[PDB]
Amino acid sequence: WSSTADPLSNLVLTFSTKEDAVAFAEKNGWSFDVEERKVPKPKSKSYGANFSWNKRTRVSTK
Amino acid sequence: SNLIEVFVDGQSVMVEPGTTVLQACEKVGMQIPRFCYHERLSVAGNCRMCLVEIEKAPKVVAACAMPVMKGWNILTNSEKSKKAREGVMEFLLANHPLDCPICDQGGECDLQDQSMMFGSDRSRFLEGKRAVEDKNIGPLVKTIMTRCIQCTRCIRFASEIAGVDDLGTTGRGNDMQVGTYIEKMFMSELSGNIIDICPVGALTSKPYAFTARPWETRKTESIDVMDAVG
Amino acid sequence: KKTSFGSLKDEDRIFTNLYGRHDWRLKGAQSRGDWYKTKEILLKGPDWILGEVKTSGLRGRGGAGFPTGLKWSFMNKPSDGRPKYLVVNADEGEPGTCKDREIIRHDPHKLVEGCLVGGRAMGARAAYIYIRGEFYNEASNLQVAIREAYEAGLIGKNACGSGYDFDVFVVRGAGAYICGEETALIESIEGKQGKPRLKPPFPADVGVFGCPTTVANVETVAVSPTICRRGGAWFASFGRERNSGTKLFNISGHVNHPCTVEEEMSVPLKELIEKHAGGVIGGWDNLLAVIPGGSSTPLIPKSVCETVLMDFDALVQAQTGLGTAAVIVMDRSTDIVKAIARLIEFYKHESCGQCTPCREGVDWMNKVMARFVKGDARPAEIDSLWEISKQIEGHTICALGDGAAWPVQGLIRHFRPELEERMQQFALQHQ
Amino acid sequence: GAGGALFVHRDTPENNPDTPFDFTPENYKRIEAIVKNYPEGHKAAAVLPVLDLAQRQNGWLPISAMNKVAEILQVPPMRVYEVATFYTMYNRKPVGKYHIQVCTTTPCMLRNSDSILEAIQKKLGIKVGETTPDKLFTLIEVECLGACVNAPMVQINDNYYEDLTPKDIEEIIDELKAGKIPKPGPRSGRFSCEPAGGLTSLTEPPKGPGFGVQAGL
Amino acid sequence: RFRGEHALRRYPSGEERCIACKLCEAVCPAQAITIEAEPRADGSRRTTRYDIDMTKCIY
Amino acid sequence: DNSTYRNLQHHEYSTYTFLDLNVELSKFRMPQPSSGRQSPRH
Numbered sequence A: 001w002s003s004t005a006d007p008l009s010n011l012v013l014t015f016s017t018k019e020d021a022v023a024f025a026e027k028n029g030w031s032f033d034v035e036e037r038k039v040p041k042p043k044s045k046s047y048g049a050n051f052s053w054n055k056r057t058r059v060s061t062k
Numbered sequence B: 001s002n003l004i005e006v007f008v009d010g011q012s013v014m015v016e017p018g019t020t021v022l023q024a025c026e027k028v029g030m031q032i033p034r035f036c037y038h039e040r041l042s043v044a045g046n047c048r049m050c051l052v053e054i055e056k057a058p059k060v061v062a063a064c065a066m067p068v069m070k071g072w073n074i075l076t077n078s079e080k081s082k083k084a085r086e087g088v089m090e091f092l093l094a095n096h097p098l099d100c101p102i103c104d105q106g107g108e109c110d111l112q113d114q115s116m117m118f119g120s121d122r123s124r125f126l127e128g129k130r131a132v133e134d135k136n137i138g139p140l141v142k143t144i145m146t147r148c149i150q151c152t153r154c155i156r157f158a159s160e161i162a163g164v165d166d167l168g169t170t171g172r173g174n175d176m177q178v179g180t181y182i183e184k185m186f187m188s189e190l191s192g193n194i195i196d197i198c199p200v201g202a203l204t205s206k207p208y209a210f211t212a213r214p215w216e217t218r219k220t221e222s223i224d225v226m227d228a229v230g
Numbered sequence C: 001k002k003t004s005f006g007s008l009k010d011e012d013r014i015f016t017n018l019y020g021r022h023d024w025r026l027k028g029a030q031s032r033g034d035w036y037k038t039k040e041i042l043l044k045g046p047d048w049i050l051g052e053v054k055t056s057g058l059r060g061r062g063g064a065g066f067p068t069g070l071k072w073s074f075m076n077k078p079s080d081g082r083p084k085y086l087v088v089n090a091d092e093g094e095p096g097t098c099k100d101r102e103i104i105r106h107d108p109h110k111l112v113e114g115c116l117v118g119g120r121a122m123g124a125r126a127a128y129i130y131i132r133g134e135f136y137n138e139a140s141n142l143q144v145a146i147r148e149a150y151e152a153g154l155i156g157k158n159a160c161g162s163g164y165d166f167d168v169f170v171v172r173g174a175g176a177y178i179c180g181e182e183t184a185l186i187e188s189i190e191g192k193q194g195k196p197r198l199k200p201p202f203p204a205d206v207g208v209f210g211c212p213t214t215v216a217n218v219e220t221v222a223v224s225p226t227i228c229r230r231g232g233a234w235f236a237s238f239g240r241e242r243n244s245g246t247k248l249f250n251i252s253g254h255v256n257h258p259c260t261v262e263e264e265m266s267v268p269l270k271e272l273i274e275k276h277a278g279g280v281i282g283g284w285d286n287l288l289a290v291i292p293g294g295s296s297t298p299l300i301p302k303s304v305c306e307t308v309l310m311d312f313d314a315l316v317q318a319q320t321g322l323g324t325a326a327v328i329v330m331d332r333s334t335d336i337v338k339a340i341a342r343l344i345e346f347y348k349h350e351s352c353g354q355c356t357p358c359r360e361g362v363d364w365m366n367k368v369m370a371r372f373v374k375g376d377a378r379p380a381e382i383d384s385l386w387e388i389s390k391q392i393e394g395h396t397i398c399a400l401g402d403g404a405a406w407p408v409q410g411l412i413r414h415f416r417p418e419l420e421e422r423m424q425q426f427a428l429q430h431q
Numbered sequence D: 001g002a003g004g005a006l007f008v009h010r011d012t013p014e015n016n017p018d019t020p021f022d023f024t025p026e027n028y029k030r031i032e033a034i035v036k037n038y039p040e041g042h043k044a045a046a047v048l049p050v051l052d053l054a055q056r057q058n059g060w061l062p063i064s065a066m067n068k069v070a071e072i073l074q075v076p077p078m079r080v081y082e083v084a085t086f087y088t089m090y091n092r093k094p095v096g097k098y099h100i101q102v103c104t105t106t107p108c109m110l111r112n113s114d115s116i117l118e119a120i121q122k123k124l125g126i127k128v129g130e131t132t133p134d135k136l137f138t139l140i141e142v143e144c145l146g147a148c149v150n151a152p153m154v155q156i157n158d159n160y161y162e163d164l165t166p167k168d169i170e171e172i173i174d175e176l177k178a179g180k181i182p183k184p185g186p187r188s189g190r191f192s193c194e195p196a197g198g199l200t201s202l203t204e205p206p207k208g209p210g211f212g213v214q215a216g217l
Numbered sequence E: 001r002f003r004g005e006h007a008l009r010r011y012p013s014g015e016e017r018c019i020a021c022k023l024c025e026a027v028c029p030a031q032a033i034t035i036e037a038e039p040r041a042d043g044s045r046r047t048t049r050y051d052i053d054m055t056k057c058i059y
Numbered sequence F: 001d002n003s004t005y006r007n008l009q010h011h012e013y014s015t016y017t018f019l020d021l022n023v024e025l026s027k028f029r030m031p032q033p034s035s036g037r038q039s040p041r042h
């Protein structure tokens, strides 16, 4: 079986905001690394671009 | 500027021209159900799972392909859109094989989750299901096409992202199948991504087969070192 | 002002060579009045032709019935750099329908002249006629007529003493009923599978080769030169309001003399059948049901057919729709359930399979109707089949799903006792 | 009900990429004309006519013919495979000299198309989807062929045989066996689908040019 | 209905019924089941480890 | 006059009649438009 010696291997906390997590980590005396949230950037979708007259976006099959 | 005012469940939002109904609903915080639409691929509009009701309109529209018009009110949780979702899920599950215990994508299935969240809880399909023969496209992707829902995500990804036109649809109607029509291996430096894009267990990782379940795995975010892209 | 319809004078018809008894070549068309003063009609301008088509009250002969003037004026926008094309829908896929084949094989010069007139009205540089693949001899006749038109200068470089260049191409399909749908037809022309594309974009914006395009039925294109020559008021004098003109009718099934005939628009169904088809085999009382507008229209029983008019509005009021004006009759000695199941099997074999509702649901309804024919089902499944048809209808990419759901709905609505009685006979005989 | 034809290709000694196929120079000129019919930015629009010409030259469509078409039109072979497998007029297996297509759709089924099918089966000694031992005839059930007025009807190699009775179709079959082509068109002498004894329309001579031309034109 | 000692069953042909779906391991309220699996020599989906801790099981 | 059927030319159509007619018509067509590229894959 998989054995462990640390008690914090399964401890995961949920926070509403980044500031709440940072404050909780600071008041508990834990050194922390913060990663900025990754958001998928908005994209331009056009069904009519599939059947293009002169561009490469024209599809060969559908 | 050129922003237009549209409504999602009665709440106003300003969107750029050409924005689809799905993106307008995303700007509010709702994810419309989908099977064939991918943000990275060209719009297909064939799974019909994204059908949604526009207020004062008798016919539902495909949210992934329909550009939103100024003043539209999208009823994302009306009885019409819910009934459309239930009907589409029923049609999708009519021929699907009872392979969940043996399917590698048990706890990671978009079909399973969207059936739980938007479909019914029972079936009235009393006929026999279809079965299609599997394909061999190399040692990386395992192919079980009875689970395929014909969303054509793999074909679009291969054509547009991987630059390989070896995938397509043969046949017609219910007997239309996704494949190569010949014994040919889909080998490219980006061939493994069709496993991720496939919403069902039709395409699965062959070296990963049968080894683990998603709820058991611990997720570590790291960086690739196989090349200099990182 | 007129109240009674159904007596169209012979000299007042358009397709004067419907039966192929005259010369279909250029000389016969010139004798019958084709290619006459087309130069002046071309010189009147697209706006005048569009106005004539609009005041004519013409509606699409394909089945949709959309006002042709509005569709053709959707192309009256200025050029943006792309070429403009007119596509003639000659796929001819609906069971019970034979009109386009006859007006192509016997009156091809009317079709070519209508192509030229529509292209001028819409500013199209060329016309692509998508003929059915099975109609090889009809396509060859159309090619011969187009060659005659090119030799005479009626089409091509300057096409007249007019200054307008217009080309007419014939492209053959290969065995696909779905290729009659306008977007599926456009895809099939471009060399792909006959899978329809979503709307928007409409063909007037993005069509064949990504260019502005109008897809028009063969009859709609063929009647335009006569409408221009005789005026839109004359064509509007026929039929009821919003239902003006004349129509080609195909009567097939259980009639003594199945035939194709052109008749005034809002003709009564029984009067049409008795005067042209020779009546129902075994008499009018022997009639059981009628499919009035091809396989996509729901059936109606004899009681409805007693006093029903053959036009868009009155047939919609009968919960049927005019469709392609293809009348399929059925007497009391035939299995209505078997015929409806055969139609559903046709739709199952003709669906392109692009979208899940049509594909899966139509296969499901085919299986359900096959079980219904033998009576191997239970009465509670009729409402389940109705709900399945509701789920298919209005949720598909194209109207093939609607055209498959509607016959089931009509059959259920008008013959539920028949299905229940068949099921109970099966139940007693199998215990 | 069911299809019965597979949409996956397995290499076979008589159907493989090494199977010899090439276009006759006259067919090459025809291909040039077909390609010329389309704008010189979209050459893939000619896949259907070129595949049809290949079938007419060969009788059916081997995988080598599809590969040749794809190479000639510079399109991926998978697109040609999709076109070949989507459209029902393409024969991906060898077919008899005379391909007999019998329509069993409801308008023809009403006018006893089953009798025509049974007569053909009894005369040829084959089932619905089989081929004769001498590779001369092939029987196939098809949907509406656009000749519902002249039901029942069959199609044999681009020709329509209409208003058929079992005797009439037996005569057609044995005369086609004899060697010369029977005349196409309806039987019973009704001259392409007007009422058999009715003549209820188009009785008087058609009006000439300018009969009803409006004023100011 | 009474629950006794755990056992792994097999089909009448003699092949074991377990297909390593790990649903029992997921549902086990005491985490008494440990499962490891891989494709078999014939490609079947079978377990290589199936452990039940009877001193953790709640039956 | 009317009783005579005059669509008899189609009984003598061969396997290449359509394509031969297209080849004949090839010389009557206006030059085709161009999208600027050899193919969308270019």
Ligand SMILES: NC(=O)C1=CN([C@@H]2O[C@H](COP(=O)(O)OP(=O)(O)OC[C@H]3O[C@@H](n4cnc5c(N)ncnc54)[C@H](O)[C@@H]3O)[C@@H](O)[C@H]2O)C=CC1
Pocket: C060, C061, C062, C063, C064, C065, C066, C071, C074, C091, C092, C093, C094, C097, C180, C182, C202, C203, C204, C215, C294, C296, C323, C324, C398, C399, C403
């Ligand atoms: N003639 C035949 O052989 C067949 C006829 N049909 C009939 O076709 C009917 C349904 O076909 P659909 O074309 O899908 O119906 P539709 O109403 O959507 O199309 C009607 C025509 O009007 C155009 N149109 C409609 N709305 C438009 C808009 N807002 N803007 C611009 N253009 C617009 C469409 O482009 C189309 O050409 C059915 O009722 C069926 O009976 C079906 C199969 C075969």
Ligand SMILES: Cc1cc2nc3c(=O)[nH]c(=O)nc-3n(C[C@H](O)[C@H](O)[C@H](O)COP(=O)(O)O)c2cc1C
Pocket: C059, C060, C061, C062, C063, C064, C065, C066, C089, C090, C091, C092, C093, C094, C177, C178, C179, C180, C181, C182, C215, C216, C217, C218, C220, C398, C399, C400
């Ligand atoms: C599945 C399907 C098949 C169709 N097949 C044909 C056809 O064979 N011929 C035709 O004229 N219209 C056909 N239509 C209707 C076309 O959409 C129609 O040609 C188009 O709407 C324009 O028709 P119009 O010129 O009469 O207005 C079909 C429609 C559907 C949904």
Ligand code: SF4
Pocket: B096, B097, B098, B099, B100, B101, B103, B104, B105, B106, B107, B109, B111, B112, B147, B199, B200, B201, B202
């Ligand atoms: S793909 Fe999803 S729904 Fe289908 S068998 Fe696999 S886990 Fe179950």
Ligand code: SF4
Pocket: B147, B148, B149, B150, B151, B152, B153, B154, B155, B178, B197, B198, B199, B200, B202, B203
């Ligand atoms: S294999 Fe997967 S991605 Fe490809 S069409 Fe089928 S379900 Fe979609």
Ligand code: SF4
Pocket: C178, C195, C196, C350, C351, C352, C353, C354, C355, C356, C358, C359, C396, C397, C398, C399, C400, C401
């Ligand atoms: S409704 Fe049927 S024929 Fe029409 S696009 Fe969908 S699957 Fe294809």
Ligand code: SF4
Pocket: E017, E018, E019, E020, E021, E022, E023, E024, E025, E035
């Ligand atoms: S893993 Fe557990 S639940 Fe799944 S088959 Fe094996 S014993 Fe049954």
Ligand code: FES
Pocket: B033, B034, B035, B036, B037, B044, B045, B046, B047, B048, B049, B050, B051, B062, B063, B064, B065
């Ligand atoms: S997500 Fe819109 S139709 Fe598939």
Ligand code: FES
Pocket: C094, C095, C096, C097, D103, D104, D105, D106, D107, D108, D143, D144, D145, D146, D147, D148, D151, D153
């Ligand atoms: S039903 Fe047979 S030709 Fe149409």
Ligand SMILES: [Mg+2]
Pocket: B105, B194, B195, B196, B197, B198, B199, B200, B201, B202, B203, B204
């Ligand atoms: Mg997958």
